[PDB]
RNA sequence: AGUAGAAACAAGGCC
RNA sequence: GGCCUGCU
């Protein structure tokens, strides 16, 4: 039958009908009479629509061939011959522009004169039944319907026929051409009734070929095919198989509970080796401040001018000389770098306006100090294979180092009060609710407690230094840059003040990965002699740069004044995390506020004021040789703030591992102290897990010592 | 006019012609998401790192013909170098602030009508009345509650057809909404937003947010009302209760 | 006196101050170089935990595979992957018996979803291993490349737009003699059957960074695109199953997890009378993923899908069949340094099979020597067990089956147990009349776990009396206690954009106040610090200050120009009006009534060249990877302002041979923008159909010109011009 | 009713420090905003500074930024003011004040209810 | 040298 | 010496 559509109809219509065939997903080889019927429907749609044009009037202009002009409007514009999505697109667009009603089924054409749709259907059966059939299929329709049938008859409601009658003679001539051409073909044994509305399909997902063999190799050891295994599974029913293997399984497979008593836990062993060194990016306990007493705010001002003005406030400069060498570098380079920094600072002082940011010369001194041109050149393996020295990067456990007493004192003095306010908080919306007033009062109390704390000063120092370093690295990637360490505080009298700890020289910072390292050299003034705790300054070079006179009742001290100079490095991640050190304030004060709220849930009243003023209640916050010492809530605030600050400063994988594996043991010990009969399956394994995190970090070793002390004081 | 004209210009060049011809409508989404740009793992680190560069943000090419290349002192506002995989050009953040001090101005009177949810929140809070804070242990029990206080009793898909018919009336397809509540919602949000020119996509998104009901599991103590859950952070705490009555009531 | 914070625990219980034990204020550990060492170590460890299995050689991939299932029962407490098929089938049968109709229903909904799912659902995924280029690429890019290759090779069933048809094409590709791929350096290369099989069965290995809570780094894996559809269907089934199990806690959030934990502890302890003792085990499973054999997941799913259409069973079984034969790419490689000659070199991992061992240290030398026998075409066969939690939900199902197997109806003894399982972590409440009963119950639970290939970490687990325990960093002590140290890293600028960052910060403060019991004063301090960091990050200072920045001039002139300066946004150098009462309001709407109409109009102008919206999914959704958890998405309330710009892209593609991808990106985006202008609903609802672009665009041009004349700007001249231009593009597409 | 006194007034050399003080009674001191206005000899008064009921939102004149600090104490019902590095032309009589609204920004900044007994030169 | 820690950075590539 | 890139 398909030979007929090969022969007669034009290409355009046959591929339109083929795409309509693909539309609903049925195959053309099984039933083709539908293809012919609907392609004839589509053909009558065209032949009825084309050759029919309109101009600004009604009364369509009919031309056998559209002449070249702007007057190519089509009388009837076709609906079908398009995908369902576009057919409904045209339906909705016509409804929204023509203000007509939206039909629920697919029309075939639209006309302007009568401003409505045409649903053309030419069926094998006579018209006077198919018409009202499709009419009762369509609900309350104003779209006019018109149908032909092979006998040659026409019909329509309203007795309406919308265009010329010679066109309809055309239609029925086409119709009988179709008819008495099948006459030569002979199809009416099924042509009248060949489609009955079949819609059914079964989804087929068959495993075959290579993928089947893979299925045959992904079974238990004693199975040969997926078919057999699935049959076995379907036939499988529970018949007490877990019990049999449990009985047969060796009894050494057990989870015996070892009781956890007061005498069970042993102190954590600390590693032994050379004392632990300093790792901070700046001096914490041994910092010195040169000040100007200016009225500018933290960010307000220009760095270089402030630094120069602060440094001019000090008199007593001496020619620098080596006091304590780096022990691994070239100290003369550090000396020359310091003198170069001074010289270029003067050079800025001379000229017209202090630059906002200064670049330094790339001398051999800072070329060595900043580690320039030291990365091995990257080459290909095929060119370097016979080199005996060629091997992997050194990948082994870090060097072992024992704890020293300097970190303990540094933390002790990091929780001490100061003679300045190191936090100038921002603005918030004016409090409107009583709860907001309570929150503001609490916040004011904590700010009064923690602002005068060395932890806040360290927070500001780190934030400013890391912000400046990151910005300089991102801006001046190539050229070495000078950045004075600046921090602005407020005195007890209320006068604002600036403080200059020293200088940082940032080097080449072409940082691609988050782990890539930018090297800088840090110089900081101090008065602490490095000849008393040399092991804490393994990586520092310390010079003697001047003498300071601070008013004291013992005449006047006239102390020496040294310069701690070192080469340090950071990374994008480290800079970003060090510039978010202000969340240590959060951590600490959230803990304290949780304490206050928990206690106030007992007594139905806010308990902040008496906690902060009466200072009757105290918490164990340290141990003295006499015994455990307790301090007021403010001291707890400062201690927790210092702990968070040191966590942010000495952060490392060792800290995370020890924190987790020691929190586990802390929970076990707490369960013991709560009389909850705690038990363990392998306590030695937990101890070994904790002890492997303690390698060389001073902070984690101090935490381990604190944990041992807590165990000793606990378990009683 | 224009649209078909850049269509013809695209089809003029062979590669885009092939892309238009062989690519089917269904694959639309795939090729639209086809990109070499990986999704950032650490957005904060790079936002703090990129903002230290010059020309850290991106803007459409049209910026080159509305904002001058430099400001009064000569600080550059935009660059003509296009982004990696787009025709947009990289520009400095000042071009934002500049646009807020001398850029073109319009009538933003209809934004309150579009962003109905946020302005309703503001109105509800502005007329609220606070009360005394009572300090006592709160037994916070976890419950499933509806957070959206303006949901019109419609699901995501249920209101999606409404949203299309309100914004994209022609792409609705087969669906013609039966429920009369949807009829009235369509009528109201059609006559209300008849000429709003913010964007079809944002209008649809905000209509989805407003009409679609959404639910989440939260620790609550008292309240349980939609209007009382948006301020759950302000009325309920660990050991304090703050009596509150939104402006709606 | 020496200060010691830990001594604070002598007065404050450990859980009431547990936040102090979370050093989440410093930089988390990161990996620096290759992850090849970790990948090799994981492969060797997975293979040696199942050493007593039986060896075979796959006839298709030619790789050695180790099957430990039904192997000898363990005789020691060391980890073992010798799961027994009959035991696990019986466990699943008991799970079904205790929950009748679970499998049949879940299979019904899964069948519905599978037969109505679309291909585009695969684009909604993070990095995936594209085999066309042998590298990780965004899910959409890899899917597009694979579809292009399939269409070039003759597999065009995916044009039906159905994920099931895409999987049919994927499987049909397995039986092809020779496929063709494209490489740029374009060159067409031919892949034989075995090479393509291994490329489709392989995984890409990387090192996990930003992982807090352990000293050593780990390795993670990413599969290809051929196997992700089957994984999607299997995980859909597993999620539908677990949603019907109250003992599971994987498909829920955190608060739901806490609620279920409280309910189970109350149920276990309350029902226990005075005579019965109760004990809670806070258990962690050692080597959870390395001991889960994909064959056992195949067994579980084929038991689940019994009495179901065979096509459903086949499509759900394809995934574990491929995992059982999965291969793993070793990794980036190894970098060597020579200090004598002062140079460095980078050898790819694919050379580990043949490269001499003189360059490697003792540990790496031994690892390579042990893993070499499993090396096939630069990748190692990893049949014995899963690599990194790809089947999270099925593992949770197995754990829930174990938990339910002690409902006192199967124990047949006075003791019994229950609890909650979330993959790699569990809480087990066991009750028994005497300590001997508790010991016997825990021993039998451990033994049954060892029969299913699941091991309990004795070093990271402990048992106490009920009332105090831990679960996924949630510490329960007669009621869950807030931590607030897990969410600390999320208190900074997110890094999306100005408005997005502001809204996300305020919303995070609000949420942590609601959930994590953040205090009022602490919340105010957090708001202040966040505002400070936000202003210092975006160079948007108050405007009344003299802080010179790259943006302080325009901000200052805008400040001096504005009359009501209280309405200026913090992004434009205005005061901050936020407070505890205003944390749930966007900044634009909070300052709407205070803004000057000129500034208000300039700010919220639709014609701004900065705002760009792509799809309904990416309107106000921000992907923030939370600390100590999987990547998560958040809805943030924000108004589309001129500050909603999107930041610059990487731009490093210009120096790589893969430079043509940018031109393809630009052309695809131009075509997509044209289509959207032709089809406005393209973004909100993704278009569907089987026609091509130009057909729809030209036909809609026809119709829209027509109707927009029937009322609108068009004119006959223009309408006819459009009609004949449509004809012109038609004949152009003809040729 | 409204009661406002002054203190600390006294002659002083330039470039020196000084601290003023005030006092209130008859109303909720922690519920209303304050300002400081000064009348120079032969010149109308103008505003100097403002402050809110929280102690948080402070502003200043254009010509005295960084040299004047303002701070209140609700408990003792006072309102301090510290001026350092005083300019020569700063010599004049200073007048306390009391806003009506709690905030500061809304409305124009001008004195409404006070009397400036205190002075300085 | 320095950062850092089971492998890396201490710029890369292209002419 | 000149130019390109900074998660590809």
Author numbering:
A (entry chain A): 1 to 716
B (entry chain C): 1 to 249
C (entry chain B): 1 to 185, 207 to 756
D (entry chain F): 1 to 121
Would you copy out the relevant sentences from the publication that reported this structure?
Central to the replication cycle of influenza viruses is the viral RNA-dependent RNA polymerase which transcribes and replicates the viral RNA genome. The influenza virus RNA-dependent RNA polymerase is a heterotrimeric multifunctional machine composed of polymerase basic 1 (PB1), polymerase basic 2 (PB2) and polymerase acidic (PA) subunits, that catalyzes both primer-independent replication (vRNA to complementary RNA (cRNA) and cRNA to vRNA synthesis) and primer-dependent transcription (vRNA to mRNA synthesis) in the nucleus of infected cells. PB1 houses the polymerase active site, whereas PB2 and PA contain, respectively, cap-binding and endonuclease domains required for transcription initiation by cap-snatching. High-resolution structures of the complete viral polymerase from a number of human, avian and bat influenza A viruses, as well as influenza B, C, and D viruses have been determined. These structures have revealed that the polymerase is a highly flexible macromolecule that can assume a variety of distinct conformations, enabling the polymerase to perform both transcription and replication that require different initiation and termination mechanisms.
Using cryo-EM we determined the structure of 17 polymerase-nanobody complexes at resolutions between 4.5 and 6.7 Å; this is sufficient resolution to accurately position each nanobody bound to the polymerase heterotrimer. Nb8192 and Nb8205 bind to PA residues 426–445 (site 4a) with Nb8205 also making a minor contact with the PB1. The site bound by Nb8192 overlaps with the polymerase dimer interface that has been identified as important for cRNA to vRNA replication. Binding at this site would therefore prevent polymerase dimerisation and, in agreement, Nb8192 was found to inhibit RNA replication for Nb82057 which has a binding site overlapping with that of Nb8192.
